[PDB]
């Protein structure tokens, strides 16, 4: 049981009213006790030498048991596979990417809501670039389609899935509708795929060999942003700015339980990191994006990395 100053107090008091929440007495004293843990957190982290700060965002009044529930993946995905079929060429490569400078070929960062589809916003996002890249048109795919369609090739909906899974699908049913005829829920519903407003359209489908992170360096300065899937900790919630790592996350495939889209990588103060766009709106991290280290397979983000060749 935590003491709670006026401070802490105050500021939970604006943070109820930023994110209209409104709380029982009894489950605001809860609450509060969760969101004035979150901050000492933070304050201690931040008052400490890291690579990256933390800071207040929509998650400060969860608990991760909570956040692990609603927004992470309910089980292990299949992310192992013994079969790969991308092999790198041959180095040096450019210093410095980022798919967002080069041209208008990133989408505008979504907001996946309380449920455990960010397998299909990394899927739209590495489509969506895809195509931009070869085309020069920048589409929005609908993720809903994914959460209500994608399950006979073993996705899960609300509750997980796979971006090399999902590009599978889509290359079978004959293409992904966008946002604008299929919108997004944020929960499990009837599947509404209609053949003649289908506009994204896959041809081929490249997985990364698990643990080959210089392919996906090769695949992002040559091709196109990356899907990939790591493992989210409590942290990780709280990510603000700079480079993320972790000494407590898992680096293997049945610990990833979140998928986001490598869109670039740097380095800085000689710490090599990516540049990677979330899902969880343009408010979180670095307006949705976060830096995370570069070269070490840092919770497991080189388990099951893929892209797909869009069919245009
Ligand atoms: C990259 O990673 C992904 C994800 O793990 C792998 O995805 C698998 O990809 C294979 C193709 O390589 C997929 O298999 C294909 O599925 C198609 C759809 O199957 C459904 O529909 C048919 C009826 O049309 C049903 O029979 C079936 O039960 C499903 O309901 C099939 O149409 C394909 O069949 C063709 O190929 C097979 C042999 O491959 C022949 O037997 C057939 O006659 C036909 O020619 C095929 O089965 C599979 O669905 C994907 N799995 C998942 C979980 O997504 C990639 O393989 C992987 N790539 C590499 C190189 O590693
Ligand atoms: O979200 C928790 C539930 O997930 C599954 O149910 C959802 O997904 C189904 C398809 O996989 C939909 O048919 C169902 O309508 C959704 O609620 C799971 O089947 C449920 O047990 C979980 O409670
Ligand atoms: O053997 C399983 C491990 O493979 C990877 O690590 C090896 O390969 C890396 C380059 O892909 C090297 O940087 C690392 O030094 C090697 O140990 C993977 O990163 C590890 O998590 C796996 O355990
Ligand atoms: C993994 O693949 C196996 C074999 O196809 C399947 O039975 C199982 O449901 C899959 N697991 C998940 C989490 O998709
Ligand atoms: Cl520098
Ligand atoms: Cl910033």
């Not at 994110?19 to 004293?29: D, L, Q």
């Not at 929005?140 to 609300?158: I, K, M, P, R, T």
């Not at 091709?223 to 790592?245: C, H, K, L, W």
Request: glycine share 8%.
């Amino acid at each position: 049981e935590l003491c709670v100053n006026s401070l802490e107090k105050f500021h939970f008091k604006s943070w109820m009213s930023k994110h209209r929440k409104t709380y029982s007495t009894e489950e605001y004293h809860h609450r509060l006790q969760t969101f004035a843990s979150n901050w000492r957190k933070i304050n201690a982290h931040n008052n400490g030498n890291h690579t990256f700060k933390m800071a207040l965002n929509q998650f400060s009044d969860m608990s991760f048991a909570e956040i692990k529930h609603k927004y992470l993946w309910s089980e292990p995905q299949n992310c192992s596979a013994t079969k790969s079929n991308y092999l790198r060429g041959t180095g040096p490569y450019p210093p410095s990417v980022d798919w967002r400078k080069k041209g208008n070929f990133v989408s505008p960062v979504k907001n996946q809501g309380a449920c455990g589809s960010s397998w299909t916003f990394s899927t739209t996002g590495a489509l969506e670039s895809a195509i931009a890249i070869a085309t020069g048109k920048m589409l929005s795919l609908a993720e809903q389609q994914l959460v209500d369609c994608a399950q006979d090739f073993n996705n899960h909906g609300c509750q997980g899935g796979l971006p090399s899974q999902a590009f599978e699908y889509i290359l079978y049913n004959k293409g992904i509708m966008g946002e604008d005829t299929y919108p997004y829920q944020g929960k499990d519903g009837y599947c509404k795929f209609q053949p003649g407003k289908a506009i994204g359209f896959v041809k081929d489908v490249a997985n990364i060999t698990i643990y080959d992170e210089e392919a996906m360096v090769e695949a992002v300065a040559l091709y196109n942003p990356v899907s990939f899937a790591f493992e989210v900790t409590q942290d990780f919630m709280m990510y603000r700015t700079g480079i993320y790592s972790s000494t407590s996350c898992h680096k293997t495939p049945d610990k990833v339980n979140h998928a986001v889209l490598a869109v670039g990588y740097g380095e800085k103060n000689g710490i090599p990191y990516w540049i990677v766009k979330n899902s969880w709106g343009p408010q979180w991290g670095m307006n949705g994006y976060f830096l995370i280290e570069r070269g070490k397979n840092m919770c497991g983000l080189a388990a099951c990395a893929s892209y797909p060749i869009p069919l245009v």
